[PDB]
TrEMBL record:
Pfam families referenced in this protein's UniProt entry, alphabetically: CppA_C (PF14507), CppA_N (PF14506)
Organism from which the protein derives: Streptococcus pneumoniae
InterPro entries: CppA_C, CppA_N, Glyas_Bleomycin-R_OHBP_Dase
Record's protein name: C3-degrading proteinase
Superkingdom assignment: Bacteria
Length: 239
């Protein structure tokens, strides 16, 4: 009961079209759902893997220092799809290569650092200095299959409600200092929610877990919304 099937991060986005151009046009993700509050992103499986959420500059500001999101990691299945992407973009931050193929880093419009790679262990990545030219026999940049994981910056004086037992390999905590690492999630453009899709939802265990804190159960009982000690929202529902 409450076994984690998938974790979906929500990143706050300032300019929608900017962020769309980046994740869809540049990176090769698919728009699944186009609501007005948010863009549901995924791949050709049709499954949601990343959510962007719009926050106006009226209400919102840029992180100073380390972000709660240290890095978003996009593990691509076909490595020739990464080379397809690079054949089309002028603006990568850094190029790597490992066992299975090339990999790169690039900053998003909200300065989130994204690693796109194809490795069974991203620790095999070696930085290539001189950029090559990339060819492609592929007819579409679209990423067919990818898996999101992430590195999260966590201060040393707080503990996440998230257990290593639960959060597996999808989530890596890096010790970190910075003013905005525990800021209320309305304050900055950053990681604002993690959604956990689970085998069966148990509201009782979750109530117990977050007893020391604010939580929310809708009248439908279809999910449980808790809040982590760094003020990232933690949403649980069935898959």
């Amino acid at each position: 009961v409450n076994q984690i099937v998938r974790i979906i991060p929500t990143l706050k986005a300032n300019n929608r079209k900017l962020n769309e151009t980046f994740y869809i046009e540049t990176l090769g993700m698919k728009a699944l759902l186009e609501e007005s509050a948010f863009l549901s992103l995924g791949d050709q499986t049709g499954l949601e893997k990343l959510v962007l959420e719009e926050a106006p500059s009226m209400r919102t500001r840029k992180v100073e220092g380390r972000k709660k999101l240290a890095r978003l990691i996009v593990k691509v299945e076909n490595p020739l799809e990464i080379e397809g992407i690079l054949s089309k973009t002028d603006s990568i931050h850094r190029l790597y290569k490992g066992q299975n193929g090339y990999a790169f880093e690039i900053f998003s419009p909200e300065d989130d650092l994204i690693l796109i790679h194809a490795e069974d262990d991203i620790a095999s990545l070696v930085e290539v200095g001189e950029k090559p030219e990339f060819q492609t026999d592929l007819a579409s940049i679209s990423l067919s299959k990818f898996e999101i994981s992430m590195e999260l910056h966590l201060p040393t004086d707080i503990e996440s409600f998230l257990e290593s037992s639960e959060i597996g390999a999808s989530l890596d905590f890096i010790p970190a200092q910075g003013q905005d690492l525990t800021v209320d999630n309305t304050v900055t453009w950053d990681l604002s929610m993690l959604k956990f899709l689970v085998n069966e939802l148990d509201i009782a265990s979750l109530r117990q877990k977050f007893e020391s804190t604010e939580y929310f159960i809708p009248k439908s009982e279809k999910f449980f919304l808790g809040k982590d000690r760094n003020n990232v929202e933690l949403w649980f529902e069935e898959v």
